[PDB]
Every structure is written in structure tokens, then in C-alpha cells.
Design a protein around this nucleic acid. Structure first.
Ligand SMILES: [K+]
Ligand SMILES: [K+]
Ligand SMILES: [K+]
Ligand SMILES: [K+]
Ligand SMILES: [K+]
Ligand SMILES: [K+]
Ligand SMILES: [K+]
Ligand SMILES: [K+]
Ligand SMILES: [K+]
Ligand SMILES: [K+]
Ligand SMILES: [K+]
Ligand SMILES: [Mg+2]
Ligand SMILES: [Mg+2]
Ligand SMILES: [Mg+2]
Ligand SMILES: [Mg+2]
Ligand SMILES: [Mg+2]
Ligand SMILES: [Mg+2]
Ligand SMILES: [Mg+2]
Ligand SMILES: [Mg+2]
Ligand SMILES: [Mg+2]
Ligand SMILES: [Mg+2]
Ligand SMILES: [Mg+2]
Ligand SMILES: [Mg+2]
Ligand SMILES: [Mg+2]
Ligand SMILES: [Mg+2]
Ligand SMILES: [Mg+2]
Ligand SMILES: [Mg+2]
Ligand SMILES: [Mg+2]
Ligand SMILES: [Mg+2]
Ligand SMILES: [Mg+2]
Ligand SMILES: [Mg+2]
Ligand SMILES: [Mg+2]
Ligand SMILES: [Mg+2]
Ligand SMILES: [Mg+2]
Ligand SMILES: [Mg+2]
Ligand SMILES: [Mg+2]
Ligand SMILES: [Mg+2]
Ligand SMILES: [Mg+2]
Ligand SMILES: [Mg+2]
Lengths: 184, 261, 147
RNA sequence: UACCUGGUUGAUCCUGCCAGUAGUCAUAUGCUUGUCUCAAAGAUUAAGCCAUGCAUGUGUAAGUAUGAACAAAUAGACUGUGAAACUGCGAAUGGCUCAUUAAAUCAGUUAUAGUUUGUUUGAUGGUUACUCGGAUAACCGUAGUAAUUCUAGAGCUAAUACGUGCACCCCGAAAGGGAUGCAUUUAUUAGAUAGCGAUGAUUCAUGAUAACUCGACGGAUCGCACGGCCGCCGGCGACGCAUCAUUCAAAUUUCUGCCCUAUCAACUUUCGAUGGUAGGAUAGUGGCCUACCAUGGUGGUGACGGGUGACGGAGAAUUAGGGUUCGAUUCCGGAGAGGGAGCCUGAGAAACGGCUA
RNA sequence: UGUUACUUUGAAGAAAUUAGAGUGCUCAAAGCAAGCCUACGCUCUGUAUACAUUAGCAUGGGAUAACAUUAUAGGAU
RNA sequence: UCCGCCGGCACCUUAUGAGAAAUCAAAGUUUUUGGGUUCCGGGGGGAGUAUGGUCGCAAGGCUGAAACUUAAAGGAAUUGAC
RNA sequence: CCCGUCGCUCCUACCGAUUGAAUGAUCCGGUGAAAUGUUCGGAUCGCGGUCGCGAGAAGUCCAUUGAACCUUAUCAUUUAGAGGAAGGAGAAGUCGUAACAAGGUUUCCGUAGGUGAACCUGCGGAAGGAUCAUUG
């Protein structure tokens, strides 16, 4: 099957390597997961070397995404893949891979923001909410996309390895870099 | 090979076992355990080749299966159990108790012990690090793990372990001026005072050891085992006391022995 | 800027969108640029501590450790991107004739942007994990030719 | 034993080879052969083809007995021994061979801060439950086929088989609630200085926090012994699950080193050649693979190609010294099982006394 | 702190084989045994040591030799 | 014309040298063997032939074997015979 | 003493029409087993309240790995071949006499032409010459 050996490769000088042994099981590869966005979740258990387990996600619809500046992590639905630095063909196929830029539902984060800052984007409770509002700052670019209900996010996990699609909300200059790529 | 080798050819066995080359095609394959296969002495060798209690491979199994042999205070029934340096072997029926120490020629010697001295052993600390839940622990070169060690204990130190309470009674810091024994290499079995420590970043650390007679020899840090603080070891040493004699000196003693004996 | 690839390049573990300021914090914390000392008596170039380049293979600001053999040689080729060919010259002893013959070996090595190198310059390379099909070394110091 | 002798001329001194001389853990063959010790032996040509038999099975007081089994006894669940069968483990070692293979194998020397590792050893696993459910083997009895440890249907019944299941932070009218074992995945944060661990060197060990997973995890198991408290409590073992360290190992890997050939001088790169970025895959590093980008990489210090009646080494023969030749074969490493390829099971195999083409 | 070769010493480095110490298998090729006295045994019995190209690692030496360097000193202090 | 110095083509005598000798003031300073460096030979034939490559208009040049065959071929010198 | 052609026998190699032949390997291409992943499929079984839930075979779809077979092409090794032609060996063949004496035209080297054959001749060169020698 798929092999990761260097025997089939040419030498650094360019000369060929004559085969001297058969393929080994300890240097094998496997078919790519090609995880897609779909409500029909499907993750298949794979038995790997040492009796360990790998989780290969074929279809995913929700992920655990973290808002770094606010230090809050919430489970949210994955809506669409918008950018992929490796191959643009992975965007129109809606493939979930690490470092892919996707849009996630903003509703879970809006609820926390209202519950935390008392703002939309009980005597002791109001005492602390106003206290936390003094040091409240929200990026204009980040706030602009809360109205549409979608947040640009980057996948930080490997769905074909761990079976999950987790990531973080884009912000700062990283958000500026990617939104410029999408401005056409 | 497609996996693990279960056989040891007799000529491939460690030389310090002193196995006759024509005794057979195979040697006892040391089982996994606290000590490495190349730095151990399987119980079959001890009971049959060293102590002569057993005359054959079969008789060793009979002795061990009766639960008549203990290593480090615990009964062992594995014929190829890897007993190693500083291990205490006890045989209650014979009232005997031995400690595995290298003689000056680099071979394991069954040093008879008194009952009082057979209640502890010395171990070399491999490393100290935090475990799960932030609990510090240290592991030794004999496969033992001790939790909540004394904060002063560091790597390469020696700890006195009580075989009854299974706790660290005392420890010796690794420093110049202590008496140490060489546990590997050419100088295996030699005892001297650690005189210097030469560190080389990214490479092995060299240690210079001076014998009681002024002979100085070097070795790697991994082959050193501190025996006591200052100049007195905490364990009983064999007659040689780690003093390596030249072949000329050894021949001189043999000649004198024949004249007297 | 250093952002020239299709993806956004950044150091892992360095959070650039923190409300608090990184003033008074160690490298790699509070958004401060991350750098480290490789040991073995080698100095961290000022261009790596105060630079803005992103190189995960950099020995000082990347995710590669130096361990193994430290070698020296002369820069033979500097045409690849962040990779050079180091020529090592040595004498091979011919036993029968009790004489020597000149031999050489070309060792590919990764060079971080903090180093400036030209053909003929003397370089020191430290071993690291495989970085490519042929690269197993990282440039640690560059001495300009004629210096 | 640091050695030479015959042969060119009518005769001489040379060059020079031919021949002789001696050895070979060197093969064959001829003739001959009483005794003792020791001892190689279908490698060379055919890694050519194979009749037959055998070379891997396995039972402890301690997983599962209702043999319509045996033995010894005599209203009891069982508790003397035990075939068969299920379950568990092993069969990846060993043995054989040298076909392919020329910086490859391999040797010395490194690295894993780049990974996996049944087992051994040490340590570590939170503040219907007086014990759950449904199957199946042996057995039993209807069979099919020329036929195979080829095979169908029915009736029974077990488990350490299989499937289940008691088992500080945030919100907040400070009540109450959420989360709260271990593991998994992501993000934020601490990991100082010269309370606060280690390295030549790591945002490392490890801690806290926000969530996440449709988690083979966190004992529905067995032997022996009987005691101590007034139903309670309790001993010494066996087996098993998980984590770290250790041991047994592997994989990949650093530097240097290999015979003849130039009547082999250029080779590599569309379809990976050299490198970069982002991914995918893998136990994990890596053009290992994909997309995109750059134009590199090697070479008279012999690349590339060709030859080998080439597995490499430890070593063997002969050796004043240097050297020459040999190394299929019992030790180590690698490789293969008629030729390829693919794969299941498993801690470990691209296995062949396993499967598929 | 210019970089090397060279040389010295040391560490590491499989066994078997080779050299070699001890030992009267009757000798020998070998083997790794044995020996001592006569008790309920002893000699802690012995099973040394050297060699091991080249490359790599670490100390001492600096003659010989290679490369690098020098005056608008980017000099030393 | 006389004396001398440096450089060049040579010659004459001589052995303390070298060499198988002829002979050589280098062809010497070599078993008391080593200043540096290039090319090149390994018994006689087959053979500078066959083949491939390369250069040339051609003639040919450069590079360059094997099968097989043979106990000598050859160098210097001596005495004869011619 | 000795050279070559021609004639006779044998041995080794070369050239050679036969789009020679056989054998092996490799490249590209075509076709393509099996397996694996994916898609669809839902025989059948079980569990709940004649509808749900779970498991799931045959088969199918796409992709991957990829044996195998079949072309052309290249390379390697072996080999047939009318005829042409080289070398060597083979007691005592034919024709001359070219080399050895100044060998009876001194020999030899390079090159060019010619002749049955050795060889001859032209041009330049060498002494390995048959001259170390004419201040006559
Ligand atoms: K292996
Ligand atoms: K098994
Ligand atoms: K090696
Ligand atoms: K080699
Ligand atoms: K990898
Ligand atoms: K890459
Ligand atoms: K297993
Ligand atoms: K003159
Ligand atoms: K003539
Ligand atoms: K003449
Ligand atoms: K003429
Ligand atoms: Mg094997
Ligand atoms: Mg290290
Ligand atoms: Mg000789
Ligand atoms: Mg004669
Ligand atoms: Mg001869
Ligand atoms: Mg079974
Ligand atoms: Mg080759
Ligand atoms: Mg190499
Ligand atoms: Mg960490
Ligand atoms: Mg990558
Ligand atoms: Mg590509
Ligand atoms: Mg060989
Ligand atoms: Mg071969
Ligand atoms: Mg061999
Ligand atoms: Mg062979
Ligand atoms: Mg054999
Ligand atoms: Mg072998
Ligand atoms: Mg195999
Ligand atoms: Mg066969
Ligand atoms: Mg196979
Ligand atoms: Mg077989
Ligand atoms: Mg087998
Ligand atoms: Mg003269
Ligand atoms: Mg000479
Ligand atoms: Mg010749
Ligand atoms: Mg004539
Ligand atoms: Mg005439
Ligand atoms: Mg004439």
C-alpha cells in the first residue's frame, strides 16, 4: 500500500536506488480522511501501531473554538470553509483540514458576551458587570462580523488524526491578513 | 528480525559470566528486570555456576519454585531474573546472604553478608522530576521509583534503601572527595576517591579517580557509583577492596603462595 | 513585511491579540518575540532576537534543537532558499603508501535569515533532526571570508 | 629460515621469462589404510524441482465440567481426578539459505529535545449491587458431498468469552445550580529572580483555567485459610484494566570508510529532481505524499552508467617488514522463503510449516 | 580565544579467533579446568593480560607542516 | 697580446665513482636504497591488428584489445670460421 | 644463415546479405486481477413503541496500491550464415634471393606511387656506417 520509505526516491546525486528489500509494515501510509462539513457526523476508529487508536473524521458539523482575547472557549457549529492556503480546490469541496479558515456561528459567543459584560453585539451582579466594563475593548473588525452572526476562525486541530475540528477566532493582524485575501 | 529475540548464543553472552564455550550452544537469556542484560547475573548462573547448589538447569527451577531464594527481600521464581550490582540475595534455609559486587577483575562476586547488613542496599539516582499532579519523584538505575524524595537529592547521587521499610534512609551527594566504585568499562570493580570532574558540554563527563595506592584512572560518569561519604564506604567490600594489582604483582603473590602453601 | 506566503506566518504559542501588554515579560510571553539560546557556547545573533522574520527551522527562534555533531566548513553554494551547501575538506589516509589524499563532502545545511553568508565564507553547522530529504544541519555561525 | 636451482651461447656477462621448490580451516580425484583423540560434510553448477514422515503447541491450589467419563463415598449447588470444548497465550524466536543489493548492506562512532515498545521490575489510580443481560462450544441428533481440521439445520448449557451497568473555577436569588476521576482535543496562562524542579540547549517536566469527546479506562473475576467483634470487620495469594519510569527492542539517524571499469563525462528535474511555505499521511522526523512557489542538486577529490562466478563484518591463508589473496558456511548485522503484489491478526509480521490475487 | 594536521596519555570500545598468564586431559591437538588435605570441608579457588587500521571523544606538547590574517588598523590599552 | 669573472656549443685526460658491458665528468653522489615533479615499460608473437569512439576532404592520425600461439626473442662482449 | 607470394591440411579470431535467430532485462503505452478506503445498496438479525432504533451480508460506485498479460523501443548475452579475408601451427613442396660480409644497389625511419613475390623508386631524415681524421 502507501509507503513512506525512501527506497523509491532518487539519491541526492540523482542516481537511482536499486531495490534491496520489500516494503515494510512499519513504514506504511493510509488514505487521507478528506473530512467534509456535513450534519451527518461520521468518525471511524482506526487501530494503529502499538494497539493505539486514531480517530478519522469523515464528516463534522460542530467544533470547539476559543476566543483568545476573551479567554473563552465554546462549542459552535461550523458553517463554511472560506480560505485554504494549501489548495483552493479544498475550499469549494468544503474540506476540513488544519489551518483552514472557516466561519463559525457567533451565537454561543454572543450569549457569553452579554452574560459577562451585559452588552449586546440583581444588585451584586450589576456591581461586577460594570466593574468589568471599565476594561472592555472590542476590535472594530471583530465586532463588524458579529452582526452577520458569523466569525472567521482557523482550524488548529487535525480532523483526520484526532477526529475533531477545533480552532480559534481570528483577530489582530492575522484577521486583517486573511480578510484581505477574501476581499475580491 | 520481525520482533524480539528470545535466545542468547553462548559465545554472545557477557564474558564476565565465565561460561565454557563448549558447554552448549545457548546461554541463559536474561529476563527483563531492574538491571540490563549485559550488566546482571541471572539466578541460574548464581545457583548453578557460582554456588554449586544446582547441578543442572532443571535443578535450578526446583530450588526457585520452592520459594527458597529472595532478591532484595522478595521471593523470585524466574530462572533468568537479572540480579545486578548491589542486589541482596538471601537463602533462608542455608542462612546465607550475599551482595553482588564486582571483584577487582570486573566480575560479579557473591560477597557474604551478615544478617544486620543484609537489610539495606545502595542505589544510584538516575533523575529527579515532577510526576502527575506535580508530585516530585526520583528513579534509580535499578528500576526503582521513589515518590516524595528529599529535595536535596539530585541526579547521580547515591541513596541508602531499606529493604524492609522500602524508604530512603540516607543519601550521599555526588562530589569530589567521596569513595566510589567503577561499575563498567575497563576499570570495572576498582575503588578509589573521586578527585576531579571534567565536564564537556554536549558530551560525556569524565571523572578522575585515584586509588588508595596513588594509581589514577579515568572513566565516564555513567560508570561511577558512590559508596560512601569521605573515604569510608557504607557497604562491606571484598578482600581486594577495589585495589587492582599488576600482573607482575599478582604473579609475585602466586609464587610466594606456592612456597608457603 | 515577512508575510509573503499564502498562509499567515507566526511563531507558535505567541499570542498577539492579548489585552494586556508584554512589557516586562520573558520572550514568547505577552506577545513578545520568542528566542532561545542553543548552548554549547554559541551566541544568539542580534538579528534573531530583534528580527521580524518567521522561520520554524531557525535554531534560535524556531522549533529545532541542536544535538549531535558540530562541524565546520566553507560555504560552497548559497542559491537555495534558506539552505546552503557546506564543503568540508579533510585528508584520507592511504595505508599501503603511508600517504594522504584530499577528499571532501558536501553537507546541506539550513541557514536562518539572521545569518548573512556568501560563497567562500567559513560556517559552523550543528546537527539537528531531519529538516528535508538531505538537510540534517543548521548554520550556527558565519565568518566572512578574509576576516 | 629476510634462501633460490634448471633452460637462449662454441664459450661468457646480462635482460627476461618458462620450469622446478614450499604452504593453503582448498576443493576434486587416484592408489593405499591397523589403533587413539578430535572433526567439516548438496555453499560453488540449479534461490532447480520435490514422493513420504517429522520440525509448535500449551493446564496451575488459583477463568469455564452435569462426558449419559473414572475412582472412592453416601439428600446434597459445586468443592477426588479429568478427556473433550470455550477462553488465554505462543507460533514475529529458533532453523535454513546468500538470490537481489556497491555509501546501499555493513563496521566503528553518534542522535532521538523525532518515535513505538506485549512482557519483567518499581511506583501510581478521585469525595440488581447480597452481583445484570442475551448467545455459543463440547455434548446431543437430522444431514449433504467423490472429497479435505469441506460444510448446512435443530435441541441444551458455562465464563477472567461477548454486551451492559451500582461503581479549586463559573453562574447567582451568600442559598441554590453548573463543572468537578483519568484519558482525549484546542486555546489562554504560569513555569521567576540570582513558594518556584531539570538540561550544553526546549514556550521542557509539571500546575491552573475555558471547553471539547458520542472515550474497548476507573475489577459484576478466581484459589487457600479461617479468625476477630456483636449481622459487622478482617489475612495471604492468583488473574486483569489504566498511567509514568524501567527493562527487553525496534525504527529512523550523524561522521568516516568498499573491488574492476572513462572503449561510461556529464547526470538529475513534465510524472519530485534540490530547496521553501501550508497541509495530508505516519508510532514519529523527512518530497514520505499533495497544492503552490523558487531553480536548484551531483560531478577528473571520478558524479552518472556498466561489470562482479559481489551479502557486509568479526575474521581465513600466507606473511623478516610492508604486502597479496580469500571471507557461501555455526558469532553479529541484513535480506529471502518458486516470481511479484496486497493484506488480516497482533505489543511486535508487509509472516509465508498465515491469508488473497 | 584564528582554524588544522602531527605527537603524547586516557576513556570508550562483543565474544570466538590471534598473541599470551595459570593448569601433568597419561603426552599432544585441546579443554577451562583444578588444587589441597581427609572433614560433613577448605584455597574469598582459577577462568589473567596485551593487541585491536582509519574515523570519532578527551587531556599534555608546539618542533616540523598546511590554511587564514596584516598599513587610510573598524588595532591594543 | 696577457690575467680573471659570468653564461653557452663542445672536446681532452682520469676513477676516488657508476654500469651487463659498450661506455658515462654524468648515465656519478643507490640494498650505506627517500630533493621535487610529469610521461612511460612488465618474455617473444598475434599487433599498433580487430572493434567502438574521436579528428581529417582523403591519405590517415589519436585512443586501443582478445582468441590463439611460442621457450626463447633480445642487449653487451669473447674466440673461431667466413 | 635467411625473407615473402603461391599450393596443401588443421586450429583460433575477424568481416559478412540474411529488415538473421534465440534468451534475459528495462522504459513508455494499453489492458487490468485482488485488496483497501469511499459511495450507494438493505438480504437478514436483534431491541422498543405496525411505526421507530441499532447492527449488517451479497452487490454497486469512485479512488488508491498494484500483480499479470500484450505492443513498439532500447540494452545485454549467446549464436547460425553463402562468401570474403587475417594470424598461427603442421621434419624433409613451388618460385625467386630481400636481409646478415661494402651480402654483391650501405642499411634503416616518415611519406607517396608501382611490381608474381620478397621488394623497387621519388622526397626529407638517421648512423644503429663501410668515415670519430685535411689549420689542406
Ligand atoms: K527488523
Ligand atoms: K502471538
Ligand atoms: K554504524
Ligand atoms: K562497507
Ligand atoms: K513523518
Ligand atoms: K516541504
Ligand atoms: K499478542
Ligand atoms: K668558458
Ligand atoms: K636492398
Ligand atoms: K648494411
Ligand atoms: K621502381
Ligand atoms: Mg530468525
Ligand atoms: Mg546528550
Ligand atoms: Mg620476500
Ligand atoms: Mg647448447
Ligand atoms: Mg610458477
Ligand atoms: Mg483454543
Ligand atoms: Mg554497480
Ligand atoms: Mg554514509
Ligand atoms: Mg508544557
Ligand atoms: Mg511538513
Ligand atoms: Mg507538487
Ligand atoms: Mg566479498
Ligand atoms: Mg550474488
Ligand atoms: Mg560471510
Ligand atoms: Mg553465490
Ligand atoms: Mg550449509
Ligand atoms: Mg546469520
Ligand atoms: Mg521475511
Ligand atoms: Mg526451490
Ligand atoms: Mg510473504
Ligand atoms: Mg517449509
Ligand atoms: Mg518461518
Ligand atoms: Mg673520458
Ligand atoms: Mg631506489
Ligand atoms: Mg610483452
Ligand atoms: Mg641480397
Ligand atoms: Mg644483385
Ligand atoms: Mg643490398
Amino acid at each position: 500500500g502507501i509507503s513512506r520509505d525512501s527506497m523509491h526516491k532518487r539519491r541526492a546525486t540523482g542516481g537511482k536506488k536499486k531495490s534491496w528489500r520489500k516494503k515494510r509494515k512499519y513504514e506504511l501510509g493510509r488514505q487521507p480522511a478528506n473530512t467534509k462539513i456535513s450534519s451527518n457526523k461520521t468518525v471511524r476508529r482506526i487501530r494503529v501501531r502499538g494497539g493505539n487508536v486514531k480517530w478519522r473524521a469523515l464528516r463534522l458539523d460542530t467544533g470547539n473554538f476559543s476566543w483568545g482575547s476573551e479567554a473563552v472557549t465554546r462549542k459552535t457549529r461550523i458553517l463554511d470553509v472560506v480560505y485554504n492556503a494549501s489548495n483552493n480546490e479544498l475550499v469549494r469541496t468544503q474540506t476540513l483540514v488544519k489551518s483552514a479558515i472557516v466561519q463559525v456561528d457567533a451565537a454561543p459567543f454572543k450569549q457569553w458576551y452579554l452574560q459577562h459584560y451585559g452588552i449586546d453585539i440583581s444588585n451584586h451582579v450589576v456591581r461586577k458587570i460594570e466593574n468589568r466594563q471599565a476594561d472592555r475593548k472590542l476590535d472594530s473588525h471583530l465586532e463588524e462580523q458579529f452582526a452577520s452572526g458569523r466569525l472567521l476562525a482557523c482550524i488548529s486541530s487535525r480532523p483526520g488524526q484526532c477526529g475533531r475540528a477545533d480552532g480559534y477566532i481570528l483577530e489582530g493582524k492575522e484577521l486583517e491578513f486573511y480578510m484581505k485575501k477574501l476581499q475580491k | 528480525a520481525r520482533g524480539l529475540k528470545k535466545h542468547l548464543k553462548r559465545l554472545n553472552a557477557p564474558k564476565h559470566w565465565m561460561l565454557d564455550k563448549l558447554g552448549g550452544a545457548f546461554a541463559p537469556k536474561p529476563s527483563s528486570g531492574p538491571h540490563k542484560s549485559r550488566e546482571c547475573l541471572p539466578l541460574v548462573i548464581i545457583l548453578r555456576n557460582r554456588l554449586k547448589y544446582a547441578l543442572t538447569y532443571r535443578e535450578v527451577i526446583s530450588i526457585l519454585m520452592q520459594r527458597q531464594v529472595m532478591v532484595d527481600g522478595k521471593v523470585r521464581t524466574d530462572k533468568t531474573y537479572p540480579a545486578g550490582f548491589m542486589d541482596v540475595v538471601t537463602i533462608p534455609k542455608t542462612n546465607e546472604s550475599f551482595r553482588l559486587l564486582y571483584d577487582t577483575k570486573g566480575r560479579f562476586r557473591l560477597h557474604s553478608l551478615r544478617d544486620e547488613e543484609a537489610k539495606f542496599k545502595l542505589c544510584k539516582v538516575r533523575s529527579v522530576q515532577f510526576g502527575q499532579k506535580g508530585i516530585p519523584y526520583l528513579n534509580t538505575y535499578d528500576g526503582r521509583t521513589i515518590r516524595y524524595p528529599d529535595p536535596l537529592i539530585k541526579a547521580n547521587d547515591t541513596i541508602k534503601l531499606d529493604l524492609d521499610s522500602n524508604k530512603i534512609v540516607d543519601f550521599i551527594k555526588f562530589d569530589v572527595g567521596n569513595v566510589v566504585m567503577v561499575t563498567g568499562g575497563r576499570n570495572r570493580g576498582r575503588v578509589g576517591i573521586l578527585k576531579n570532574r571534567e565536564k564537556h558540554k554536549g558530551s560525556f563527563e569524565t571523572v578522575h579517580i585515584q586509588d588508595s595506592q596513588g594509581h589514577e584512572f579515568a572513566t565516564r560518569l555513567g560508570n561511577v557509583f558512590t559508596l560512601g561519604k569521605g573515604s569510608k564506604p557504607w557497604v562491606s567490600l571484598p578482600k581486594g577492596k577495589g585495589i587492582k594489582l599488576s600482573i607482575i604483582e599478582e604473579a609475585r603473590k602466586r609464587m610466594a603462595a606456592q612456597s608457603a602453601t | 513585511a515577512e508575510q509573503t506566503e499564502k498562509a499567515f506566518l507566526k511563531q507558535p504559542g505567541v499570542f498577539l491579540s492579548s489585552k494586556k501588554t508584554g512589557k516586562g515579560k520573558r520572550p514568547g510571553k505577552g506577545g513578545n518575540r520568542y528566542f532561545k539560546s542553543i548552548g554549547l557556547g554559541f551566541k544568539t545573533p542580534r538579528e534573531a532576537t530583534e528580527g521580524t522574520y518567521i522561520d520554524k527551522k531557525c535554531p534560535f527562534t524556531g522549533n529545532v534543537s541542536i544535538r549531535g555533531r558540530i562541524l565546520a566548513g566553507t560555504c560552497h553554494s548559497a542559491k537555495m532558499n534558506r539552505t546552503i551547501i557546506v564543503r568540508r575538506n579533510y585528508l584520507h589516509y592511504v595505508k599501503k603508501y603511508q600517504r594522504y589524499e584530499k577528499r571532501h563532502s558536501n553537507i546541506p545545511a539550513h541557514i536562518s535569515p539572521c545569518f548573512r553568508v556568501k560563497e567562500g565564507d567559513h560556517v559552523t553547522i550543528g546537527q539537528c533532526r531531519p529538516l528535508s530529504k538531505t538537510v540534517r544541519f543548521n548554520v550556527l555561525k558565519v565568518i566572512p571570508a578574509g576576516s
